[model samples]
Target: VKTLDVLRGELRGQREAFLSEIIKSDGPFTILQLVGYLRVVDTDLLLKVDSTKVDEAGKKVKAYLEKIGIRGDSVEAALDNLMIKVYEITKGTVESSAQGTDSEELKTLLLKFSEDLKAEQELHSEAKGGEALLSSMKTQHDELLKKFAALTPTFLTSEDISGYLTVPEYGAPMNAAKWAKVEGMIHGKLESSEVPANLKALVAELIELRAQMMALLYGPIGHH
Candidate 1:
């Protein structure tokens, strides 16, 4: 429960202390170092300080100043007053108005960086989904082959091997459509009781499950 008068006095003391610290040093050199420090630690504030918006710079300065224990009734007025003090101390050695337009290109570059970052993140998400689907399809395909091998010791016949060998590898490279055709041949053989008559029901179920997986893995997303 501090009174307004006490608060004002405390703030005045703090501001004086802060000003004296600056006053004791080489003001021109110190101000340059202060700007470099702000550039590294508070880039947004550094940009605002160089920007033309007085109120925005004032608000940024006020927040930063308060963090360092300096306050005033009117922060904008404080900013103006401090600028005047800084100007007097520098004795016209520093020029603030000349560098007003320096940050425009940097601002454009920053905006471009954000857009590129977002686009890369979206592509990363897409590839992650593709990786997961690929892994799942591979596991299901291996299990299907295992089941077929368990039922029939030799799942592929000599005729089937001859048929596969006849297809020229260079004629048409591997693709989803080609893979579907291969699976379709396997399904036809299963339906024809190539395994055993007792496993007809199992073959039927495998055919249905295989068709669904083919559609999923060879759909538009499969192109990924």
Candidate 2:
């Protein structure tokens, strides 16, 4: 209850305000994960207090914390457990329901993920799979917009702006007409004046990338 009282208030002030979604998560482990997430912060707060010579009567409040929070850790196993749980709960991947905002190596890992994502581009040249082409384009296009949008106007967390990345399941081939109409819709969108000039150019290039996909998938684009 104490943990929830504190965490609920603090989480509400966050950028994305994930407290609600986290609460919505239905599982046997929900409370345990939430407690693991909050406990680290709670321990950090407790660790700093002068728990020495701090013995006063009826002062059971401080005494209580002094007992458990400062109870100290066992050598090997307890230390390893603490380190692993802290990292996992605080900065593990989104798939793990952790924000990953607090990871020490987040920058390096995110950069590597970025590179691995675009590496799909090379395979597109080899006609490995449309999945790779679309996935690569989707990643690059989103990252470009994300990085750009962060700087020019106001500062925003690059991670915050980057949308979710996932493989789209368009498994087998669809009709050629369907692909054409999709292309036409894209072309019309880029042609629209509603898009800013600079953004239009970006969309145009991305569309060109998609055009590459249509060619590889639906087989060639030529004169009518």
TM-scores of the candidates are: 0.28, 0.23
The candidate that achieves the highest TM-score relative to the unseen native structure: 1
lDDT of 2 by residue, 1-224 (tens): 53633543343233012222333333222222222222222221222222221111112322322233312132122223333333333345233222123344443433333333234333343455655656775676575555445434322234432233312222221222332343344444545556455554554444333333333322211112
User: Mind giving the per-residue lDDT tens digits that candidate 1 earns over 171-195?
Assistant: 1112223333444455555445455
Worst 10 residues of 2 by lDDT: 49-58
Candidate 1 at residue 100, lDDT? 24
The best candidate by lDDT is 1
lDDT of 1 at 218: 29
Which residues of candidate 1, in runs, are more than 4 Å off? 1-128, 157-198, 218-224
Residue pairs in collision within model 2: none
Q: Residue 197 of model 2: what lDDT?
A: 58
